[PDB]
Amino acid sequence: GRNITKVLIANRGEIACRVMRTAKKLGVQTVAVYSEADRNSMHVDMADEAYSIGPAPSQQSYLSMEKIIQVAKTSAAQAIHPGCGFLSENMEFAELCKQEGIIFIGPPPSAIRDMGIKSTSKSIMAAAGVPVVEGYHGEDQSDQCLKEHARRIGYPVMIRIVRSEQEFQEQLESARRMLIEKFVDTPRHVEVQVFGDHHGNAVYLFERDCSVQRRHQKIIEEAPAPGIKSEVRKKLGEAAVRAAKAVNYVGAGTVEFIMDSKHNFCFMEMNTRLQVEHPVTEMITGTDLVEWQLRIAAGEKIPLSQEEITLQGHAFEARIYAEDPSNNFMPVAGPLVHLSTPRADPSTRIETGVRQGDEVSVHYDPMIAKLVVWAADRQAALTKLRYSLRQYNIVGLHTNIDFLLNLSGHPEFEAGNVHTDFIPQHHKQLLLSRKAAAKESLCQAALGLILKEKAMTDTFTLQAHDQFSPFSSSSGRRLNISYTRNMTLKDGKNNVAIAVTYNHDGSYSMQIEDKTFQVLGNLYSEGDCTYLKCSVNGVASKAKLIILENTIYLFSKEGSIEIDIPVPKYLSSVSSQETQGGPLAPMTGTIEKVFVKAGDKVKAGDSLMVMIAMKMEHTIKSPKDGTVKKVFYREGAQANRHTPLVEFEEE
Amino acid sequence: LRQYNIVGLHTNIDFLLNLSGHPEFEAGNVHTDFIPQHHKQLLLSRKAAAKESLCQAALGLILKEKAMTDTFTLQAHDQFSPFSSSSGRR
Amino acid sequence: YHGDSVASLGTQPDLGSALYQENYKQMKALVNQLHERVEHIKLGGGEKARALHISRGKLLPRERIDNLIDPGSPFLELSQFAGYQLYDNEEVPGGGIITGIGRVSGVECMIIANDATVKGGAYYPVTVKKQLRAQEIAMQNRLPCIYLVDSGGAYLPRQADVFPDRDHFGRTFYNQAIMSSKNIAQIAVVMGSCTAGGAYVPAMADENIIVRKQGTIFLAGSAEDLGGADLHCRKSGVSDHWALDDHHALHLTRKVVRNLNYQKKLDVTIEPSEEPLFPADELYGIVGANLKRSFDVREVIARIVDGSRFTEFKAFYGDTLVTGFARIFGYPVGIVGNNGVLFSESAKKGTHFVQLCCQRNIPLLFLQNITGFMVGREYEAEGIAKDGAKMVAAVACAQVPKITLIIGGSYGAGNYGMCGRAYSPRFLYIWPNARISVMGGEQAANVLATITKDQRAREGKQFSSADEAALKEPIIKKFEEEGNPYYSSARVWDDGIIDPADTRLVLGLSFSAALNAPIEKTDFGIFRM
């Protein structure tokens, strides 16, 4: 019950950084909590104080109510911000904070409990007059009872779609080989934002659309939701406002409604999670909701009246994930060797919890970041989103960025005809195979390797005493003749041979197959990213160039191409097998042990035989992973020095 | 005010920090005799430091020595000798 | 251009393998044993002696070194185990003297401090040998010598082993005079009593510092009136600087070194340092403590060289010996390590390699794990002795800095060919599992079991199998006891027993110190072709 000057953030990752940013702009001191893995995390370095809450598993760290309360007491934090997930929807934790005199920055326990129970929330919501969806949740399965409930809900219903009473029995038996709801093409999910003060006043921010869903996880959020009439927008929000006042709602909140078509909507659930799709609403209404939440939690009234709240433009939110679309959106954990994003501006807001050089971990959700763009109309905002997504680049792990670009490109999305089967219906179109690269792109990659070598020559020159030597030039010039370099690069599974002639002017003439290209270029650095400015046959382009391992990565506004540099066999270590055909006896000695049968599959480092020579034990090891063709010696045999011990099948 | 740092002469900054944190000033109960009336609380004596502060001071001294070692190493031909480390290893 | 990609040595060991588990457990116990024994030696004379030492206002010998060297700089102590169980009933921790290499005012110096808490700082025979070894190291590497003098004179009961001979106490002053003539600074800090020969140390030094009341100098032994800082500082003139206390004297010493007008210059090419690609503690499992089992020396190399990069020379010829080029902390090094019994090809391969390193002025590192030379009628007919001698002769004449590390057995003439103590390596270190002797314990036992089996078979009285172990068991016990690393290190045969995990750091410090002296041209003798 005090003004908040210090706040503990009982969360990690991006949400923790977002809450902290509002606190810094407000002068409120910030306390982080952290696990052993997140010791160097961005939210730890961002806080004014940070405390360890134990090991990496969240059950023993971020979900440990006792440790969070202990840190809040030890840091003298007056308030706890739970963020989203973890303890944010835990009734016990909220009551414990109230018992210990710490301000929980979130809703009252009564609201958390009432919303949590589906029956209680629906009963109050029907009392609020909010339209309700009709479903049968009864455990009883008698075919007669299920059929009577299907009639009461009215056809069509979902068990198997049931369009009429005559088909009910066949569809029920098919589904069994139950719960009944209402079926219809109802895939538009429209949600509203409501804020309520301790004084009981409430305002409605404009609605958003979360219709697009992948693996039961929302992917794209657009505010205001497309196609909603100005009059419908007022009515939908006012119903949410009346419902919030009736339940005495305090703090931020999201009320969800379901519209199949023709502006017919019904309540689904109300969430106190402070959903992370909040940024789109903030941009359209020009308000900071984290700031409003901190002020309201302290006890202040809602900052703006409903008349003051206004809707401007359109915003889109896209969440980057480390999930790999090819393995059915499988989550991936790996080092982020390169991370870059679209430049920040009032129109373009990037919300991220990770930095270049950070490592993604299986312990927590893999979402890399959330990207928000703002513009006057939906189509213009969509164009900006694609422009920004192309400017988002990640190297070192798999990402959903390509899938997002394809989805935004799809014509139906641009129309605004969004339904939650969008990904299954257009699955073939959304996932597309790589096409063969153009010869021009291959020329750019070759230039990139040549220019990188020139930079390496320059680095050595700086150390050298003879800085101005003509040899340190990268001219590749011979007396009376021109140097042509034969270089091979691999695109996909295809080896490409490029012949590069180093011209006197400093340009390079490259011939791939029967086509000759005149290429000139330079490497320039903006920020920490090297960029290649190049002209091929007079067409000029700029791309970001990263060469890591044996792969050349060129990222351009048009597209990203990855080309491979072939690895020499001697370095490949296939040569190590070639250096000797068979393992021989180290010295003349008795064979004490044989570990291989006449036909046995062995891997390099598998012991084959043990030999004692002059009372000195030697263990013979498998040179290759090849299966054993034959054995030349048995136990107790004396083997002469350098005599073949094992024969390996030719491969 | 905490971010403002002044070394080389005495200033009223710590007095302003005590004054701006006084309960009657927070309440807005101000008058021309406020400083005379609350002189005892506004002027604050020094209190013994915590052991954590002493540890931080020692760490700062050690790190300053390490920085001096790096500065010397910059000008030496033997740039990568293990002796240039500040490990204090035995 | 240094952008070429290259192959790297080393392989990931099978941590689950029983052999690795056993080897790690055995080696770990040896390292723990080594650590706790050093802790005891760290205490010197004991609590009563230490309390008395502090009661006089003097710093403890190891605290003096801590204050003398640069803040946070590593200190390479040498021969920590000198005098360990050397004398029957007398305990002499560290020999009564502490020697090592540390950085003072940014300059690498040799520090020689008497431990007054040990027998009052008296000079035992091992104490003289330890000091003489330190002086030899300083001269060969041009390291300034700092003497923290607090001594009680020679130990009379053992005078015959201290005073008379060439390598006895007299040689200490000879070394000081020679180093001074070569512009290797000699600095003496009298922080206590020095009597008889002790008084010569401050007198023979280029610059000298004495504490106000603790220090005393006199050829013939109140002590303050006879000696004392005031008498020597103001009247005798033996003192160059006058110090109030131990802290003041150490501060003065740092100033003296800063005025040496010395700057280190490197004769070798330098490249940026890189850590090895494999953990060093894996050496515990790879090597173990059983000398009968064999391991690939390349595994040891892969875990100490920069980036685990190694260019092998003559890989398929004389494979029992491994030679190649690498870098440690940026310095170039040529590595020679045993990988089996020495053969004629191995000796020839080594001789060729040593000539290459000497020609290019590349420091040499030897990794001794020997089991002997090839034994056979054919090998002798082909001049294995002639081939083995080729290597002994090349190694001896090499003028590049040489460092030897005994990671296993060291027996017979194999020791000489691999730069043993007799061949003046700049430093010599041993792992806690090493064994050294004229021959392996078993060979001496078996050889005797031939001589006396013959003795009684040829004489005609039968000599039974039980008579065999009344012959063999005492021999094996003797060689095991005298080949133990502590036995070798108690006497100064090596410069210390080092934990394998510390091998890379010790080598880096040692090579860095050895580079203070310019590398000379190598002159070889006649190569008996």
Side-chain angles (χ1 to χ4, degrees):
Chain A
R2 280 298 181 92
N3 204 10
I4 309 165
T5 72
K6 177 179 280 179
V7 54
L8 181 150
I9 301 83
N11 216 310
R12 56 173 313 274
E14 50 93 21
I15 176 65
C17 298
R18 169 72 193 96
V19 176
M20 284 173 197
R21 264 166 290 182
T22 280
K24 305 296 180 169
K25 293 179 179 179
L26 282 188
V28 188
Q29 294 182 321
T30 54
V31 185
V33 294
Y34 69 87
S35 56
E36 300 168 355
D38 309 328
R39 179 173 301 267
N40 306 324
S41 295
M42 188 179 180
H43 72 281
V44 177
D45 292 345
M46 185 176 174
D48 308 301
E49 296 169 35
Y51 294 82
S52 182
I53 55 166
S58 297
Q59 291 181 11
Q60 300 178 23
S61 53
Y62 293 102
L63 295 172
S64 184
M65 295 183 252
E66 294 173 358
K67 291 182 183 177
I68 300 297
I69 292 295
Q70 184 57 44
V71 176
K73 289 177 172 180
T74 296
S75 61
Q78 298 131 331
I80 294 166
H81 195 292
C84 59
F86 301 118
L87 299 173
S88 56
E89 293 172 301
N90 191 274
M91 176 261 302
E92 294 80 9
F93 177 67
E95 190 63 32
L96 184 54
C97 287
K98 177 185 167 194
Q99 289 172 2
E100 300 292 10
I102 306 161
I103 302 169
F104 181 79
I105 301 162
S110 61
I112 306 179
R113 169 207 57 189
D114 293 353
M115 298 323 165
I117 314 173
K118 281 200 172 182
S119 68
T120 305
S121 57
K122 288 167 188 177
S123 301
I124 314 176
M125 292 319 276
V130 170
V132 286
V133 49
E134 297 83 18
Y136 178 47
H137 50 85
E139 286 76 35
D140 183 32
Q141 296 308 320
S142 178
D143 291 16
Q144 229 191 11
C145 184
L146 294 176
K147 191 173 182 179
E148 199 68 26
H149 276 289
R151 296 171 253 212
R152 182 177 171 172
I153 295 161
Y155 297 96
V157 300
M158 189 83 79
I159 304 180
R160 304 294 198 273
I161 295 148
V162 196
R163 300 178 174 272
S164 70
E165 191 175 328
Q166 291 161 359
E167 54 190 293
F168 185 86
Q169 188 63 33
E170 184 185 358
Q171 294 303 336
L172 179 63
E173 288 175 15
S174 189
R176 283 224 189 91
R177 280 180 289 196
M178 295 297 113
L179 66 98
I180 319 285
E181 233 97 271
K182 164 102 192 159
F183 158 80
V184 56
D185 306 346
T186 184
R188 284 262 317 216
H189 160 79
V190 176
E191 60 173 16
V192 189
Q193 181 84 13
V194 279
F195 239 106
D197 60 4
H198 287 279
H199 310 259
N201 313 330
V203 288
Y204 63 87
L205 282 87
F206 307 95
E207 87 290 349
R208 326 193 282 263
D209 182 84
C210 289
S211 301
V212 175
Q213 307 273 167
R214 182 182 65 198
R215 305 285 287 185
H216 317 295
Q217 202 176 205
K218 301 158 297 184
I219 197 50
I220 289 204
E221 301 81 21
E222 30 175 350
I228 303 301
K229 300 189 175 184
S230 62
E231 196 178 1
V232 170
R233 188 165 283 104
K234 174 187 177 181
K235 295 169 175 175
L236 162 72
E238 279 176 346
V241 156
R242 291 186 299 268
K245 289 181 177 179
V247 298
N248 308 348
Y249 201 75
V250 179
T254 290
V255 192
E256 312 182 4
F257 295 83
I258 299 179
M259 185 251 294
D260 58 331
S261 183
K262 323 120 192 167
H263 304 286
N264 307 326
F265 55 92
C266 295
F267 181 72
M268 190 224 286
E269 66 166 344
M270 184 173 189
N271 287 155
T272 79
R273 55 185 62 254
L274 188 147
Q275 293 177 335
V276 281
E277 42 245 68
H278 69 88
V280 298
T281 202
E282 293 191 357
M283 302 268 268
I284 64 180
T285 60
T287 59
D288 187 320
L289 292 198
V290 171
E291 180 200 7
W292 279 36
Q293 211 165 358
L294 295 185
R295 290 166 161 264
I296 285 196
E300 304 175 22
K301 290 194 173 181
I302 293 186
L304 296 175
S305 83
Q306 191 64 72
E307 294 83 18
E308 294 167 354
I309 303 178
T310 49
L311 168 62
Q312 305 182 12
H314 202 101
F316 275 96
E317 183 174 339
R319 313 186 195 182
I320 313 295
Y321 283 97
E323 299 158 357
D324 169 42
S326 301
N327 296 10
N328 218 336
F329 307 106
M330 176 178 73
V332 172
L336 291 144
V337 188
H338 165 84
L339 167 60
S340 187
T341 83
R343 191 176 183 177
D345 54 88
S347 285
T348 305
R349 166 183 172 185
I350 316 102
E351 294 290 324
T352 178
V354 294
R355 297 154 308 185
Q356 176 167 343
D358 292 12
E359 207 265 338
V360 187
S361 203
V362 278
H363 308 300
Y364 312 99
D365 180 79
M367 171 166 55
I368 307 292
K370 304 184 318 192
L371 179 62
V372 175
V373 288
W374 184 86
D377 65 272
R378 186 196 191 277
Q379 191 56 52
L382 190 45
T383 312
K384 193 151 191 168
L385 177 71
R386 302 196 80 190
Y387 183 80
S388 301
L389 277 165
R390 295 151 191 281
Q391 301 292 331
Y392 205 112
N393 309 134
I394 299 190
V395 175
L397 45 89
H398 321 306
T399 59
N400 62 336
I401 308 182
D402 56 340
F403 172 83
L404 281 170
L405 277 171
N406 296 351
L407 191 136
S408 49
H410 191 283
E412 288 293 333
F413 187 72
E414 299 182 349
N417 306 334
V418 280
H419 50 89
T420 189
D421 211 59
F422 206 94
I423 186 167
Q425 279 197 194
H426 312 292
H427 182 62
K428 308 169 185 177
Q429 326 175 20
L430 294 177
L431 177 63
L432 203 61
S433 306
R434 278 181 40 181
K435 311 182 189 308
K439 296 181 182 178
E440 287 83 4
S441 306
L442 281 155
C443 290
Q444 298 183 8
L447 182 63
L449 191 56
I450 297 173
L451 290 191
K452 225 70 173 182
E453 293 161 349
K454 180 185 186 63
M456 186 58 64
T457 315
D458 299 344
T459 299
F460 189 80
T461 311
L462 294 180
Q463 289 106 44
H465 300 303
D466 196 5
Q467 303 179 1
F468 311 111
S469 62
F471 276 113
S472 64
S473 176
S474 304
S475 56
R477 181 177 181 170
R478 314 286 171 262
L479 295 185
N480 309 327
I481 41 173
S482 278
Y483 169 50
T484 304
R485 176 177 168 179
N486 303 315
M487 54 185 305
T488 310
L489 285 175
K490 194 178 189 192
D491 171 39
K493 315 167 186 176
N494 325 312
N495 283 343
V496 179
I498 315 175
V500 182
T501 300
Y502 285 56
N503 302 327
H504 295 290
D505 61 346
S507 78
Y508 310 91
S509 294
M510 308 187 182
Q511 191 190 356
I512 305 183
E513 295 186 10
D514 54 289
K515 300 179 190 170
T516 314
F517 303 86
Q518 309 292 323
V519 186
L520 62 80
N522 73 281
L523 280 187
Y524 65 98
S525 300
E526 288 179 343
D528 300 344
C529 311
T530 310
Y531 278 91
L532 169 68
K533 177 188 176 184
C534 52
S535 169
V536 180
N537 277 342
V539 187
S541 52
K542 293 179 179 179
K544 192 185 309 180
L545 167 74
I546 291 98
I547 303 185
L548 178 66
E549 308 292 335
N550 291 279
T551 308
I552 302 175
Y553 295 95
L554 279 168
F555 296 96
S556 88
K557 47 250 136 165
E558 298 98 14
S560 157
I561 303 301
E562 293 177 350
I563 306 292
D564 303 307
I565 316 166
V567 181
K569 318 170 188 184
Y570 44 88
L571 288 184
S572 83
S573 189
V574 166
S575 66
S576 73
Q577 165 262 319
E578 216 161 355
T579 57
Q580 293 177 335
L584 313 170
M587 267 197 54
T588 304
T590 299
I591 298 286
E592 183 65 13
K593 293 179 179 179
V594 172
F595 307 105
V596 296
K597 293 179 179 179
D600 182 27
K601 293 179 179 179
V602 278
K603 293 179 179 179
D606 283 13
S607 53
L608 303 175
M609 285 180 184
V610 155
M611 164 184 294
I612 61 171
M614 257 116 174
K615 334 161 207 152
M616 174 63 58
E617 293 177 350
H618 320 275
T619 299
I620 309 302
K621 278 186 173 60
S622 183
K624 60 200 69 174
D625 290 25
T627 301
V628 63
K629 194 166 180 182
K630 251 176 184 177
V631 175
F632 296 97
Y633 288 97
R634 304 189 311 175
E635 297 188 5
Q638 290 202 5
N640 290 357
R641 187 163 189 262
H642 293 297
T643 56
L645 296 175
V646 171
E647 186 183 3
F648 281 94
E649 307 177 356
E650 228 291 326
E651 183 178 2
Chain B
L1 269 163
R2 286 158 194 172
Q3 315 303 308
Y4 215 129
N5 306 145
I6 305 193
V7 181
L9 61 93
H10 295 291
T11 68
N12 73 340
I13 295 173
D14 292 336
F15 171 79
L16 292 167
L17 281 170
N18 292 339
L19 194 153
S20 58
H22 187 279
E24 295 301 307
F25 188 83
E26 292 186 354
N29 294 342
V30 297
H31 57 95
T32 57
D33 294 321
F34 184 94
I35 295 177
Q37 178 170 324
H38 307 295
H39 243 322
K40 21 240 141 291
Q41 22 261 2
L42 299 176
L43 298 184
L44 239 13
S45 93
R46 173 151 288 266
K47 189 180 53 180
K51 300 197 191 187
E52 292 82 1
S53 306
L54 295 156
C55 294
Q56 296 177 17
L59 183 56
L61 186 50
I62 298 169
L63 293 188
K64 223 67 168 190
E65 291 156 343
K66 180 196 200 69
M68 200 102 57
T69 312
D70 299 350
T71 289
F72 184 81
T73 310
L74 277 184
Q75 305 124 18
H77 307 128
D78 197 3
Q79 304 261 346
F80 311 104
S81 61
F83 276 114
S84 290
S85 181
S86 302
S87 51
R89 280 226 39 188
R90 261 52 146 181
Chain C
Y1 189 90
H2 285 0
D4 269 359
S5 301
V6 283
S8 57
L9 260 192
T11 59
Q12 170 70 27
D14 190 6
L15 313 181
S17 71
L19 181 74
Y20 183 94
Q21 315 264 26
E22 181 200 8
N23 278 355
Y24 197 98
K25 172 176 321 316
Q26 284 178 345
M27 183 66 75
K28 194 64 188 310
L30 290 182
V31 166
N32 291 344
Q33 190 192 45
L34 173 71
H35 167 79
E36 71 207 11
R37 289 179 172 184
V38 166
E39 292 300 320
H40 178 77
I41 290 175
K42 196 193 192 313
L43 299 179
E47 286 336 310
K48 270 193 70 298
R50 284 158 70 89
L52 178 65
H53 193 85
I54 289 175
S55 84
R56 302 180 186 177
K58 319 166 67 173
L59 284 179
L60 283 174
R62 292 183 179 273
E63 301 179 352
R64 292 164 167 174
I65 297 177
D66 299 344
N67 287 262
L68 177 53
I69 64 185
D70 287 348
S73 75
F75 178 69
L76 180 59
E77 191 181 347
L78 304 163
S79 294
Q80 297 176 318
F81 281 91
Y84 179 75
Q85 302 180 347
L86 191 53
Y87 306 116
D88 42 20
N89 294 300
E90 325 195 58
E91 184 175 346
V92 194
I97 201 161
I98 307 165
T99 73
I101 304 178
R103 256 206 194 162
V104 186
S105 285
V107 174
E108 278 104 42
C109 302
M110 180 77 77
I111 301 161
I112 310 187
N114 302 114
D115 192 340
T117 79
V118 175
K119 307 294 184 178
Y123 268 85
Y124 280 74
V126 80
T127 317
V128 177
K129 191 174 183 176
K130 192 171 163 177
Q131 180 172 225
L132 289 187
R133 176 53 185 161
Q135 284 180 323
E136 180 178 14
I137 292 176
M139 177 175 344
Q140 284 177 353
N141 305 300
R142 296 195 124 264
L143 306 171
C145 289
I146 301 164
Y147 307 88
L148 309 183
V149 189
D150 194 352
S151 172
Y155 182 66
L156 275 66
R158 282 180 158 93
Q159 62 100 26
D161 297 319
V162 176
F163 170 76
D165 211 352
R166 180 208 76 198
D167 298 328
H168 283 176
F169 193 65
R171 196 67 165 180
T172 298
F173 313 133
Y174 172 91
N175 288 343
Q176 280 186 252
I178 296 305
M179 292 193 252
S180 174
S181 78
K182 306 184 171 293
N183 192 31
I184 304 169
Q186 306 287 289
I187 308 144
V189 194
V190 181
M191 325 189 63
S193 182
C194 55
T195 169
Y200 276 83
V201 182
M204 294 300 293
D206 303 4
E207 224 157 334
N208 159 347
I209 302 150
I210 186 171
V211 183
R212 168 191 234 166
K213 52 134 190 176
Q214 314 169 2
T216 54
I217 311 162
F218 25 70
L219 177 63
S222 73
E224 190 70 20
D225 290 1
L226 199 55
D230 295 319
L231 173 63
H232 298 308
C233 281
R234 313 166 192 267
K235 309 63 145 193
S236 93
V238 170
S239 147
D240 312 329
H241 302 267
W242 184 90
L244 305 148
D245 53 80
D246 278 6
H247 280 284
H248 189 210
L250 300 174
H251 167 86
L252 283 174
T253 310
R254 298 178 52 82
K255 300 180 56 176
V256 166
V257 176
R258 194 161 168 182
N259 295 329
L260 291 184
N261 193 32
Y262 168 76
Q263 176 173 49
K264 186 179 191 168
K265 281 151 190 3
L266 287 180
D267 297 22
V268 294
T269 67
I270 291 298
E271 285 181 17
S273 176
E274 292 196 16
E275 289 305 299
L277 296 184
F278 290 98
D281 84 302
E282 290 174 345
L283 285 177
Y284 294 172
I286 294 169
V287 174
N290 179 3
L291 292 189
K292 316 264 47 163
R293 297 173 212 167
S294 68
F295 56 88
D296 188 5
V297 69
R298 287 180 192 86
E299 294 302 327
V300 175
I301 298 174
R303 278 153 184 85
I304 65 184
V305 295
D306 298 355
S308 300
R309 289 186 296 263
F310 183 72
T311 317
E312 193 157 343
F313 171 82
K314 283 254 207 54
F316 299 133
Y317 180 78
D319 59 311
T320 48
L321 192 69
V322 174
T323 68
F325 294 105
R327 284 192 177 263
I328 303 178
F329 284 102
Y331 308 124
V333 299
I335 303 173
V336 185
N338 301 115
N339 222 19
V341 175
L342 266 164
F343 287 89
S344 296
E345 297 80 18
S346 319
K348 290 169 170 173
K349 165 185 176 164
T351 306
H352 190 332
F353 190 69
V354 164
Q355 296 180 66
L356 274 176
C357 292
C358 289
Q359 210 196 25
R360 311 172 183 176
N361 288 354
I362 299 187
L364 270 161
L365 165 68
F366 295 85
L367 304 179
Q368 293 203 13
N369 178 14
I370 294 169
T371 43
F373 264 89
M374 197 48 258
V375 172
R377 176 173 179 175
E378 56 285 313
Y379 305 99
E380 309 301 328
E382 302 161 343
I384 180 169
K386 180 179 59 175
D387 296 321
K390 297 177 173 63
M391 209 176 47
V392 164
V395 161
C397 296
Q399 294 296 296
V400 287
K402 288 167 306 188
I403 297 175
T404 299
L405 176 64
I406 300 172
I407 62 181
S410 187
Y411 306 113
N415 173 268
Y416 309 152
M418 293 302 275
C419 210
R421 187 66 133 179
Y423 293 77
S424 292
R426 300 284 176 94
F427 300 85
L428 198 146
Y429 302 104
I430 75 191
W431 278 359
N433 68 296
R435 291 293 187 280
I436 170 169
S437 48
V438 59
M439 59 189 69
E442 294 202 353
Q443 321 180 29
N446 294 2
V447 175
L448 295 174
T450 79
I451 310 186
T452 299
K453 183 178 179 180
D454 265 39
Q455 186 173 355
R456 317 312 190 104
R458 181 177 181 170
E459 280 173 350
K461 315 104 156 179
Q462 314 285 281
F463 207 54
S464 181
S465 300
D467 289 345
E468 294 301 78
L471 206 58
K472 302 177 60 156
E473 183 178 2
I475 279 309
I476 293 202
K477 169 175 320 317
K478 180 198 176 189
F479 274 68
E480 180 66 5
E481 157 205 348
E482 300 177 358
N484 186 267
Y486 295 96
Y487 191 98
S488 159
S489 199
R491 304 130 191 83
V492 188
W493 298 352
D494 55 73
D495 299 318
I497 313 175
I498 67 171
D499 167 20
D502 287 345
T503 292
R504 177 175 159 86
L505 172 59
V506 170
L507 294 181
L509 291 173
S510 303
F511 273 119
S512 179
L515 292 183
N516 276 274
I519 302 183
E520 301 314 59
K521 154 134 191 103
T522 294
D523 286 312
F524 287 110
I526 294 187
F527 285 110
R528 174 170 298 271
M529 302 294 342

